[PDB]
Amino acid sequence: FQSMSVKGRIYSILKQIGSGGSSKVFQVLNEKKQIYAIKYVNLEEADNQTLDSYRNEIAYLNKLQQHSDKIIRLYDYEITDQYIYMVMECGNIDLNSWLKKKKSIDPWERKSYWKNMLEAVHTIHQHGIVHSDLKPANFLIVDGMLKLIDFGIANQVGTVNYMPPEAIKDMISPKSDVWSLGCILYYMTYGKTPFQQIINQISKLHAIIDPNHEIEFPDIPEKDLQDVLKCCLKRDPKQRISIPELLAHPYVQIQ
Ligand SMILES: COc1cc(OC2CCN(C)CC2)ccc1Nc1ncc2c(n1)n(C1CCCC1)c(=O)n2C
């Protein structure tokens, strides 16, 4: 059994949840036997722009948690020249792992999750943040609630199935996140992303930008859900619905 120290407080490591870019996420217990998630970041090989991207995301995370409970909690952190330790909220599972494990999703569960994703993404937009790389792995289930875990600021790896056509053309506005959220809801509706069937990545990238390539929206009992999907997956950002409009949509309002 291994331990860690964060700002004088001792944490015993239970297990490693994940491992990213020079990073590890651990499930830990504090002195009062409370469960937390500790994100460890190794700063050994990080350059000044990478460091500035890390500091900037921490500051936004720290500031934005007061504005919405749909943003993961950041309780404390320890930052040196060698590492970052972030004491965070521990969730049950990320949305990507949950969706991959589940056969059929409940329409009520789908709707509450969609409301949470809208509230979290709306919060970051109000602060001038466009995520631009939204995917289900950016969301965490904490007591039947979805929380955004990151803001896309700091430097499902390289997935293209949630990419807006304008991100492919450029290589970004708040509308880019609407397309990505639309793809997540489409996955929660039909069990696949709109272009998932296209295995070849270049042929898939061409389909996402092609106006002639029609996205299929098969008939479902929830007509409002079908409408949200069609409104989100408009290839022209100017013709795409906004987050404030999605928040007043019958799909999230009509009980
Ligand atoms: C119970 O602990 C979990 C288990 C879990 O299940 C994963 C399913 C797939 N396997 C391969 C790994 C565990 C996902 C998230 C969590 N909780 C959690 N709670 C808090 C987390 C956090 N994850 N993550 C990453 C998201 C993906 C991996 C780590 C974080 O960055 N924080 C702050």
> How many Cβ atoms are within 10 Å of 192's Cβ, its own excluded?
11
Please say whether the beta carbons of 233 and 186 come within 8 A. Answer: yes
Please say whether the beta carbons of 124 and 64 come within 8 A. Answer: yes
Is 176 part of any known ligand binding site? no
Is 12 part of any known ligand binding site? no
Give the active site residue among 69, 76, 81, 133.
133
106 given a catalytic annotation = no
Atom of ligand 1 nearest to the CA of 88: 33
CATH superfamily of 93-255: Transferase(Phosphotransferase) domain 1 (1.10.510.10)
Any idea where the domains of the chain sit in the sequence? 4-92, 93-255
Q: Which residues, including other chains, have CB under 8 Å from residue 187's CB and lie 6 or more apart?
A: 99, 136, 193
Pocket test for ligand 1, best of 140, 142, 146 (most atoms within 8 A of CB): 140
Q: Which residues pair with 164 in a beta bridge?
A: none
Q: Which fold has domain 4-92?
A: Phosphorylase Kinase; domain 1 (3.30.200)
Residues having CB within 6 Å of any atom of ligand 1: 17-18, 25, 27, 37, 39, 72, 88, 90-94, 97, 140, 149
Q: Which amino acid, 131?
A: H
Q: Which H, E and C letters describe 28-78, residue by residue?
A: EECCCCCEEEEEEEECCCCCHHHHHHHHHHHHHHHHHCCCCCCECCEEEEE
Q: Map tokens 């998630």 to a residue.
A: 37
Please say whether the beta carbons of 166 and 155 come within 8 A. Answer: no
The resolution, in Å, is: 2.2
